[PDB]
Amino acid sequence: DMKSLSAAAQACVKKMRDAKVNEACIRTFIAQHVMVSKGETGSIPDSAIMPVDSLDALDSLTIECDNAVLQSTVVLKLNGGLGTGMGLCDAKTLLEVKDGKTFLDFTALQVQYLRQHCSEHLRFMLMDSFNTSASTKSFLKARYPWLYQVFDSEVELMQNQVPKILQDTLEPAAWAENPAYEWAPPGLGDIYTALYGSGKLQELVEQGYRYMFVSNGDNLGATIDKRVLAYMEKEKIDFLMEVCRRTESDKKGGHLARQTVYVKGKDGQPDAEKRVLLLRESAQCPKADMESFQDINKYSFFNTNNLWIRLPVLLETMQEHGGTLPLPVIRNEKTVDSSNSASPKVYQLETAMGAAIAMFESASAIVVPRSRFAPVKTCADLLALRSDAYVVTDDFRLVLDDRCHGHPPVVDLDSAHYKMMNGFEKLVQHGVPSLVECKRVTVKGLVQFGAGNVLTGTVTIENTDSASAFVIPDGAKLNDTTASP
């Protein structure tokens, strides 16, 4: 808290103040710092948690909220990330997904739709990083002028940065070579801090906003559902997390868990127990416990990052904690320069947005279909979306064509040539093949689609000479075949 801080901590405070990091962020970080200095490692072992047996599901819900609720609703999209995994040096949300629209186009259109059809007061917010801000703003200025006019004052929330601290001392790392490396984002849990520190949460609450839907900017599936709001009104939920069933491909990703608090009586005469939901990511899991962490039957619920928050409760909670949300610290072990392994060893302190599930008395989780968690991880994914296996709804949502029957075309793309965006674009330079009526397409080696290519059933296009490009001709219809030169 007040100093009454250690020298290491004060040095952190000093560096942040000089930099001039937001005070809420300083308060939040320092509280983490103190924990770490008292021995907190952030580890969550299997002994400390129980699995969650069952949860309500979205599919049970039919009732839609009315317009008046939406009027009190804020959409916040996390827009910090770069497109780096796909070779894209820009905000990930600015990647073109379908029909020449970005993720951000779809979100902005969805919002406009809600504003047009339900509620002009529904608010839209972006959480940007320093890396993404200018580009996002320029994109709006061109394409969404209404957002642009309010960008600095209403839309944009800035992510904080926090100092890396040396492992032995907890004092700020120094890297004369590159001073930026001294800093890191804090990461996703920082949203609460940013919202509080900026004064935005207070502003939102005072204007009468009641709900926030928070989601990844890169999740196409994350769209406002009116059922969820009605459910929140009805059940009086303060924090709601959407989860999907954890599949094998998610076994290395964050799961739901529970703990219990037994409150002995305590002059009521009744011994009470409360369930507490929490999130556990792999960085919190001891090696000994990892195989269990990876048991998808046992921990079957995966956090989507679609979160619904009752804003006044969040504010009141932050206020009751010295203007913070005291999320559990994740204390990563790193080197100040990650790539250089002789750099000083550091702790990078982060929190998870999802981890807020533990902070509220009225928190729950709801099982949602996988369609609500639809990121683009690979150019193979992008291929499927750009294809006619997907259609755009009246309200600007992306959904599978009916003919798919809930099954996407499976796309296998050679990572020698298509891992990155420049490579991918080249493959589709003369058009995107029709994949709707296609179960699987595999592309091996260097290929270019023709215009008007239609793939049916299972198709492989293989070119085995890497000094060549195999070009499919216009009109090609390939059904249940392998094509090759």
Of 323, 345, 376, which closes a domain? 376
Put residue 117 in one of left, alpha, beta given phi > 0 → left and psi -120 to 50 → alpha. Answer: alpha
CATH at residue 395 = 2.160.10.10
Distance CA 412, CA 372 (A): 23
Marked catalytic residue, from 3, 274, 377, 477: 377
Same domain, 363 and 483: no
**Spatial contact of 377 and 85, defined as CB atoms under 8 Å apart:** yes
Instruction: Look up the domain containing 330 and give its range.
Output: 1-376
- Name the CA dihedral angle for 415, 81, 307, 67, rounded to a multiple of 10 degrees: -110
Backbone angles phi, psi at 92, to 5 degrees: -60, -35
CATH at residue 142 = 3.90.550.10
Same domain, 54 and 185: yes
Same domain, 360 and 470: no
Burial 395-416 (b: 16+ CB within 10 A, else e): ebbbebeeebeeebbebebbee
Alpha-carbon Rg for the chain in angstroms: 24
Distance CA 397, CA 372 (A): 11
The β-bridge relationship of strands 239-245 and 301-310 is antiparallel
Distance CA 354, CA 280 (A): 9
- Token duo for residue 236: 């009086």
Classify residue 397 by its DSSP letter: -
* All residues at 6 or more sequence positions from 190 whose CB lies less than 8 Å from its CB, including other chains: 25, 159, 160, 351
Same domain, 44 and 78: yes
What is the Cα 140 distance to its own chain's centre? 21
Distance CA 365, CA 22 (A): 31
Amino acid at 45: P
Evaluated on CA atoms 195, 22, 137, 418, the torsion sign reads negative
Same domain, 71 and 15: yes
Between the alpha carbon of residue 241 and those of residues 145, 307, 353, the distances in Å are 32, 5, 10
Of 376, 411, 443, which closes a domain? 376
Same domain, 296 and 384: no
- Token duo for residue 299: 């921990």
- Token duo for residue 226: 């009116």
Amino acid at 447: V
Same domain, 19 and 107: yes
User: What element of type H or E holds 17?
Assistant: helix 7-18
- Token duo for residue 409: 């075309």
Nearest alpha carbon to residue 477 among 442, 436, 434: 434
Nearest alpha carbon to residue 306 among 232, 225, 378, 193: 225
Backbone angles phi, psi at 20, to 5 degrees: -80, 90
This PDB structure is determined at a resolution in Å of 2.3
Distance CA 102, CA 96 (A): 4
Helices (H) and strands (E) in the chain, counts: 13, 28
**Spatial contact of 113 and 105, defined as CB atoms under 8 Å apart:** no
Nearest alpha carbon to residue 279 among 309, 298, 308, 258: 258
Query: Is 345 labeled as catalytic in the residue annotation?
Result: no
The β-bridge relationship of strands 454-462 and 482-483 is parallel
Nearest alpha carbon to residue 165 among 281, 284, 43, 32: 32
Distance CA 244, CA 213 (A): 17
The β-bridge relationship of strands 165-166 and 454-462 is unpaired
**Spatial contact of 337 and 178, defined as CB atoms under 8 Å apart:** yes
Same domain, 283 and 310: yes
Instruction: Work out how many domains the chain is built from and give that number.
Output: 2
